[PDB]
Amino acid sequence: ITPGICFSTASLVLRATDVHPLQRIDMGRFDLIGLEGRVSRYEADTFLPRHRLSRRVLLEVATAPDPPPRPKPVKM
Amino acid sequence: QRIASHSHVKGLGLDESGLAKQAASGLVGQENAREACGVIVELIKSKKMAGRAVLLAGPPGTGKTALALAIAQELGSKVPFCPMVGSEVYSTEIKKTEVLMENFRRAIGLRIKETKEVYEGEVTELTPCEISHVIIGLKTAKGTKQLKLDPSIFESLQKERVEAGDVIYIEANSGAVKRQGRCDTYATEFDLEAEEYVPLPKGDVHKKKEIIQDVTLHDLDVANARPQGGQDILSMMGQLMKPKKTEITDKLRGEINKVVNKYIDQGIAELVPGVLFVDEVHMLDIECFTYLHRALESSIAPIVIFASNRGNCVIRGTEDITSPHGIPLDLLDRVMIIRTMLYTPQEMKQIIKIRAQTEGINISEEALNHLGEIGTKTTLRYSVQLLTPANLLAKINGKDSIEKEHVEEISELFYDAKSSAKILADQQDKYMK
Amino acid sequence: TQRIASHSHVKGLGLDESGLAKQAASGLVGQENAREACGVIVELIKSKKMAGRAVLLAGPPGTGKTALALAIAQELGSKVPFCPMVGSEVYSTEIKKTEVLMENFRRAIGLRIKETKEVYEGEVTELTPCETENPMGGYGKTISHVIIGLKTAKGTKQLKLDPSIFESLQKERVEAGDVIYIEANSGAVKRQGRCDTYATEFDLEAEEYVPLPKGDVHKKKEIIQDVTLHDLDVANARPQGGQDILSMMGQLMKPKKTEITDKLRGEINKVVNKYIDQGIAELVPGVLFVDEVHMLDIECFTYLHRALESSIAPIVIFASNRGNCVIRGTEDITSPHGIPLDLLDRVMIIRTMLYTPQEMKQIIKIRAQTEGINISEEALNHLGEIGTKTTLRYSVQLLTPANLLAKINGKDSIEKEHVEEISELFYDAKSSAKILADQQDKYMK
Amino acid sequence: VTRIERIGAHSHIRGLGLDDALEPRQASQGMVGQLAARRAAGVVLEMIREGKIAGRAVLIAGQPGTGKTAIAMGMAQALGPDTPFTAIAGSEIFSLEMSKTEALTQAFRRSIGVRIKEETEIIEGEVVEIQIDRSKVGKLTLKTTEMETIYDLGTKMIESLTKDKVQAGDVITIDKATGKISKLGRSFTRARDYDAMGSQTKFVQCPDGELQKRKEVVHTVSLHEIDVINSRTQGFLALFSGDTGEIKSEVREQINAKVAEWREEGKAEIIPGVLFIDEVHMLDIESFSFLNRALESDMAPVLIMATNRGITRIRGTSYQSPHGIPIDLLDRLLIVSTTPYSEKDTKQILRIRCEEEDVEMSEDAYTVLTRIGLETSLRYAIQLITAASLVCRKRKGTEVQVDDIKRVYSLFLDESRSTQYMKEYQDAFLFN
Amino acid sequence: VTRIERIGAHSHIRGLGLDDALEPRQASQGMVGQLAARRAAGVVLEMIREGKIAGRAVLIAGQPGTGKTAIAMGMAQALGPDTPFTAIAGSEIFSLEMSKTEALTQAFRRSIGVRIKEETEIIEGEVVEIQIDRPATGTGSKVGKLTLKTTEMETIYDLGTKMIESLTKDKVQAGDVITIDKATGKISKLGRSFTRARDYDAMGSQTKFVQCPDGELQKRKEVVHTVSLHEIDVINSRTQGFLALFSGDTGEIKSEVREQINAKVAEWREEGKAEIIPGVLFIDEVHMLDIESFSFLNRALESDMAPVLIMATNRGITRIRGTSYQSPHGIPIDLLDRLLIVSTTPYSEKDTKQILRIRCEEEDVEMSEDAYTVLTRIGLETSLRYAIQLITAASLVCRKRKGTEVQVDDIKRVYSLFLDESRSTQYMKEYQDAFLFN
Amino acid sequence: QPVASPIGPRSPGPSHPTFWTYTEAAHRAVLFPQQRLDQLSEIIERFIFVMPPVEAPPPSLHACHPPPWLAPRQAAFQEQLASELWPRARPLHRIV
Ligand SMILES: Nc1ncnc2c1ncn2[C@@H]1O[C@H](COP(=O)(O)OP(=O)(O)O)[C@@H](O)[C@H]1O
Ligand SMILES: Nc1ncnc2c1ncn2[C@@H]1O[C@H](COP(=O)(O)OP(=O)(O)O)[C@@H](O)[C@H]1O
Ligand SMILES: Nc1ncnc2c1ncn2[C@@H]1O[C@H](COP(=O)(O)OP(=O)(O)O)[C@@H](O)[C@H]1O
Ligand SMILES: Nc1ncnc2c1ncn2[C@@H]1O[C@H](COP(=O)(O)OP(=O)(O)O)[C@@H](O)[C@H]1O
Ligand SMILES: [Mg+2]
Ligand SMILES: [Mg+2]
């Protein structure tokens, strides 16, 4: 049994590939392979074109007061 | 023990002055070559020079490989001796230069002192301690001890199904837990338990043993290039997903050199430079020879013995470049050439007699003379190979010794290369291609 | 199946009951001697008592070698394995050529397995232990049977089972109203969900509710499964379905063909022999068809000697249209069919001859019938004349372009003018070669 | 703006320029001349569209620059995007990962399209409340803009809901047959005004209509895609990486049978297409031998090929054959020959290229460029079109004149002039 | 029913057909003629059986169809299954997974068998009554009792927890004849002494019974484990190596592993744990090996773990593969010096007729004397293999016409239907232009 | 999942056509790796002996001021991989 090899390097080397978020763009807008097994044709083709939010709806919901409390169930 | 082609070679048969005795240690001739090999053996024993190359040159059957194995026998089993064939560098996993470099490091051995820490006893308490550690109680015939061990050791104990009453062996260096059996004291409780019982250890619970380990530089390189000592999931993953050999870098070899130098300075390691033997060197290509230039120029390299039976032959990997031994002239400038000669009929008879004694065969003088005459034509190898079939024929006929009739009958049954060549030439139109 | 391929008209060898070949039958025209020899080979295959026998179909291109092999396959039927293969397929980036050849050899040897699967289906109506009036040991209750009531669409039956099933029933969490099946050959209970009659429209479970089984409670059937030795070899070399780390690695890593060892193949042979002796399985030795055998190299040809000498090998049919060509992998070695003379000594050669104009006309008519094309007599004669020059394949390939041209022109049959226009539009090999030779400077290389 | 598709060597070709009788017009849809070749291509295109006959091979042969690739692109454009058209070069079958026959098999199976049609019942709504008792049984409340109902959950449904961490306000769909839950989004409320959002969260409107809905999905996939999907556990990943390897023949046979079953059941339709191999002379003899018997399958597309070789050497052999293709394969295919262009055809092609690139040229410039194209080559003149346009724009001109064409002729050399200049200084160049 | 093994090329060869003095009979055990070659093969077989000399090489050389492979198969059949016999072709060493030297090493090590013999205590009896008491709920110690019976004994065993678990997993019931190994606790069911209760349902059709074992319950039996050196190398190369025994995919085994295994096997042999059973490697068509492979063969035969190597080749003075050198048999002269060569002479007319008779007997084909004469003439004119193929061809033709004995007409019919190499080459010369490349 | 195999997929029950297509005889001719291990237990116990001459843990990368997120991320990855894969490696315990 031998001790392992301790390979020492400069701490700056470990940050060579790191890029600050304010210096890089979002690569998730080109992520096609990440949608496989998670996103369906229904969501992309039928649902989202019909049920996308608009700025008007978002503003109306944000400005409007809180909805009334949900009524308690009644056996009727 | 089976009798191989060189089983009679026990040494170089040299006297105290270095001169070669005529017949000694299973060698009959090649006195000059044996003296040169004795000098090479002294060079290897000096452990001072690095990367010194020797070429054994001569026709086939002149005992070049016998002389290499005699050098090995003279050195002893402690000194590493790596035999490789030139055809073995053509691997489908690593480059030819990598194969050569790995064989170079295999020739350098290291005798290193190691201390093994052992926990051995019958388990009396196995209490987990919340990742969960383990508190274990071990008893022997001399005492009892309680130990706190890492969670990995607890996982190993669980995998071994160790329960209270089992005799276990723990190696603290490698964390290797072995369950040996249920204690013998419980072997009477049941009539069919499906258990293997083991007596109680009669020493102490904790033992320290110092042993001498024989390793090579290649072993260290492999251990540090394909690690399996962490016992973690990543090691298993790497072993299963990457089982092939890899081209070990010069950086790893430099680190191993530093570690071994540190070990030698600490006084716990001894270096044995050792020997590499390449038998069919002409099978190497120009790339291998060019690499071997720099490899032999290294101050770490071992002593390398080369062999060749080729004449003025085209170097493999070149189109039409022809060199005296199949070896480019640049490498021949870096080698010491030992020349082997053809054997006289008397030496052939001596070798035949030695081989007969080695194979446990009694041969009459008339049969020995006839077989030496047979070896004068054809080859010595063919004459030696007729000993066992002739012995089998004599045994079938009820004779305990080989007579001339058995040798004649066997030679009639089996042809040699020249006779087969004559048959092929006479009937070229009937054979394929 | 609906699309028409090049050998869609070959329905077998047009052989009389005595083995003589009819002039035109089963889609085949002429080649009477070759058809008779192929019928003898079909009888050899059906006899199932010979191994490693090889047949070479030798003749000029377009003489029915592939058509004859496919006719042999049609004669044997789908029961007999038939593994087509071209010589170029042995050159793989994953396994060696000998491994590809061995795998195709094992693909040609089939195995038919017959078993009876007896099951008890039903919805559990009753689950009652059968206690004993004398409890063993004096205390507690002892049970000797467990009565399970199974209900199906057209019946209801009760089964007095072993007491040991009580553990299986609890492990499967079987209760009343659940649909289960019990296998006689194993004595195990499997819960295939709950009956759908107890499900309400407001439930959201997906695989929990199952329809009440139709038919009888006791269902038994004979299962015939056809497998090949290569199937067992591959399923054992890279097994699928384990839960250990090695199966997980197999699922993760990219699949790759491997060099299956003789140990695994010998084990498979032993298992197959055991099944045959038990009466479970019947061996179905088939045919390996190796088209373009001349594309094999000298290593493949050399390996074929040992492959054919084996007692497990199938009957191999080769086909080569080469003359005194140079064997691949060798430097300037010429053999009569591109095949070394050692392998030619191990094969029976069937010769295919060229077609007379009448046979070419018959084949063209058959191909027109297969493609659903009506052709006039004058157009047929002109296409046969075109086939006398050029080749037969060129003439049979003008049928569909000419039919399309007629349909565009508004006619339901091919006339001579349509064939003439198609012949003007499309060139054959010889005419193109003449053009190339006349303008060799303007072309490349 | 500048889109990813820009002016290429065949951007001016929109079709084969045929009428209803497949008679080629002199200049239609961007094609000039090659009347016989275009008529033959149209006949082959009708054969492709019918789809009845399998494994038909056509070779477009002719001198360099005679419109072979132009005709292939015209066939591809005239054929709808619905019908597959796999265009590969001969060199692309030489792969380090799979054999040549495997590459050709994948190319053949990429040329057959399978259009699937699945109809599935789903539940679609916004999650209002999830109550789980203790996790053996629970209730789920879903709502739309016009409906609201409560569902009783089982063990597996509760486990699936907990695995996906479905909570209130989430807009989800549940498949009735399989029970799988996919989250479309979440509803926006006043309290969900997040300052930072996760990479997958998105706000959607609550669905309208009825909670139970039918989902119909129609998509076109190729046989090669189905092979890759079923090659390994996550084989669909190889449709992106390309690390397919050599797919087992048994898998392909199973998929052929399953596709036939789908076709009988009405769940799939087969659209046989075209595999175009450009510069086939790069194929080796083994590839040709494989092609010989690959065309004989009932699932083989139309193989259109194009070579410009004369009687040359077959790759991998020492034999001479009329197109570099063995005569055995040449008997399996119909040859469409392209003739050299005349002066009028060259001028019309130059006019079409100028219109495509939006370059104005004088008639004298057109005459000079046509003379250059006849003397050197058509492609050289086509390149000179853009070179002269750039030079004209540099001198603040609006129409290319003869001076611009002469200037770019002096600046850029064709093969003949460059070869002559090299021969003048032959010793300067290396390895003559 | 037809087994997986059918009538092949060498199915009639049951051995070399020698007497005690290794003198070949004219026709025995399928072999006909080749007296000198069969005697030499017998001497080599005795050398193999003695198993004392390592790395002996024999070359069987002769014209095509002279019985080289027949002699090799006779040697294999005379050796028996106890001694390993690895038969490979020369082309098989060219592999994309391993080097040629690695493939040759694996082939060599597949021809040496390591056998471990040890004695274990074994309990074999008929289960009379088994009782297992387990806690109703929660973890607890199962207690059980087992009764085993032979014809002369009956003992009641108190069972431990692990033996209880083994019996539960094997589902051992009363009347089951079981075998128990005391050390490992493995239980193997080998039958039922009688049927189960009839009143039970879903039990299936009861099979045949097995007679109850006799003698004492706890006997002592000798267990023999035999593996080859290649199997040891593969299972020791890596953790997943045991699967590589079936999937191949061994890669290149480290030389360190093989050296350690050689040392351990030598230690076992000295310590009496294991015995080495050297075998034979038969490389058919050895001329496909290149110079590198032959160079490896030269030195690999010098090991004490090397088996007997037998080669067959029908080449004359031929170019060695991978070189431009002409050598006898396509083999370098350095390797030809390390081996004895056994020549096979061509067959005469009577030997050909006897071979045809043996083939007909193996194929269960009845043939007339005139048909035998015609077939022997055809075999002498064409080749032996062509006549052998015509045997079954004419059998099928005769069976088609509802006959019982193969006549001259059937042989003529199959001679017309199926062509030899000579007539095929003649007909191809007649139409040389029709064939593609000449 | 088991495409083109003698082993059939997990049929829900006899109502599915796959139930009556595959045989138990075909299933018993295919051995999983666990069955192979159970078949070679005696061979594993008697013939698996080769030990590497040297054993080392993997080389470690050390920096004075590393990114404080690299080590916890690697630790979490290793922990998850071990928790998912170590139970599956138990059959190989005797070989190791
Ligand atoms: N001088 C010698 N004395 C005794 N035996 C010898 C001698 N030289 C060679 N031999 C034996 O004869 C055989 C041939 O020698 P070898 O070393 O193989 O020649 P090569 O130089 O071709 O390798 C071997 O069995 C070897 O042990
Ligand atoms: N005797 C025949 N009867 C019917 N069709 C034939 C006959 N011979 C050839 N064909 C057909 O003509 C075409 C030529 O292919 P084929 O003759 O098989 O070429 P090859 O023999 O070189 O493989 C195929 O469609 C084949 O089915
Ligand atoms: N008939 C044609 N109509 C329009 N453009 C053509 C025509 N023939 C060739 N071209 C154009 O000339 C150039 C060369 O023709 P191309 O077909 O690529 O040559 P090849 O036939 O040698 O492949 C391309 O830019 C192509 O668009
Ligand atoms: N002496 C013989 N006795 C019995 N069968 C023989 C004999 N010689 C050849 N045969 C048979 O004839 C065929 C050709 O012989 P074979 O050994 O294959 O020739 P080769 O020397 O080329 O291997 C084989 O089926 C073989 O079994
Ligand atoms: Mg082009
Ligand atoms: Mg042979």
PDB file of C-alpha atoms in Angstrom, chain F residues 46-82:
ATOM      1  CA  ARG F  46     -10.533 -21.723  -5.691  1.00  0.00           C
ATOM      2  CA  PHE F  47      -8.977 -19.970  -8.712  1.00  0.00           C
ATOM      3  CA  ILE F  48      -9.218 -16.197  -8.078  1.00  0.00           C
ATOM      4  CA  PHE F  49      -5.924 -15.335  -6.374  1.00  0.00           C
ATOM      5  CA  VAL F  50      -3.965 -12.733  -8.377  1.00  0.00           C
ATOM      6  CA  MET F  51      -3.191  -9.576  -6.406  1.00  0.00           C
ATOM      7  CA  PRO F  52      -1.619  -6.398  -7.796  1.00  0.00           C
ATOM      8  CA  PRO F  53       1.907  -5.945  -6.418  1.00  0.00           C
ATOM      9  CA  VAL F  54       1.181  -2.306  -5.503  1.00  0.00           C
ATOM     10  CA  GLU F  55      -2.022  -0.557  -4.435  1.00  0.00           C
ATOM     11  CA  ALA F  56      -2.521   3.210  -4.375  1.00  0.00           C
ATOM     12  CA  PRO F  57      -5.394   5.671  -3.985  1.00  0.00           C
ATOM     13  CA  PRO F  58      -6.078   7.960  -6.949  1.00  0.00           C
ATOM     14  CA  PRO F  59      -3.894  11.056  -7.381  1.00  0.00           C
ATOM     15  CA  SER F  60      -5.259  14.122  -5.604  1.00  0.00           C
ATOM     16  CA  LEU F  61      -5.301  17.683  -6.941  1.00  0.00           C
ATOM     17  CA  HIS F  62      -4.283  20.300  -4.366  1.00  0.00           C
ATOM     18  CA  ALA F  63      -4.437  24.085  -4.636  1.00  0.00           C
ATOM     19  CA  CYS F  64      -3.889  26.624  -1.879  1.00  0.00           C
ATOM     20  CA  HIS F  65      -7.116  28.553  -2.601  1.00  0.00           C
ATOM     21  CA  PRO F  66      -9.365  26.338  -4.733  1.00  0.00           C
ATOM     22  CA  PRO F  67     -12.851  27.325  -5.874  1.00  0.00           C
ATOM     23  CA  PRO F  68     -14.886  26.583  -2.734  1.00  0.00           C
ATOM     24  CA  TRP F  69     -17.620  24.905  -4.818  1.00  0.00           C
ATOM     25  CA  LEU F  70     -15.565  22.242  -6.617  1.00  0.00           C
ATOM     26  CA  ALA F  71     -14.916  19.984  -3.624  1.00  0.00           C
ATOM     27  CA  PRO F  72     -18.512  19.977  -2.264  1.00  0.00           C
ATOM     28  CA  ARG F  73     -19.846  19.306  -5.768  1.00  0.00           C
ATOM     29  CA  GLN F  74     -17.483  16.362  -6.227  1.00  0.00           C
ATOM     30  CA  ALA F  75     -18.368  15.090  -2.753  1.00  0.00           C
ATOM     31  CA  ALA F  76     -22.098  15.226  -3.495  1.00  0.00           C
ATOM     32  CA  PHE F  77     -21.620  13.507  -6.860  1.00  0.00           C
ATOM     33  CA  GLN F  78     -19.582  10.740  -5.230  1.00  0.00           C
ATOM     34  CA  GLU F  79     -22.111  10.340  -2.412  1.00  0.00           C
ATOM     35  CA  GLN F  80     -25.062  10.032  -4.791  1.00  0.00           C
ATOM     36  CA  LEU F  81     -23.203   7.641  -7.096  1.00  0.00           C
ATOM     37  CA  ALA F  82     -22.190   5.474  -4.135  1.00  0.00           C
TER      38      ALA F  82
END
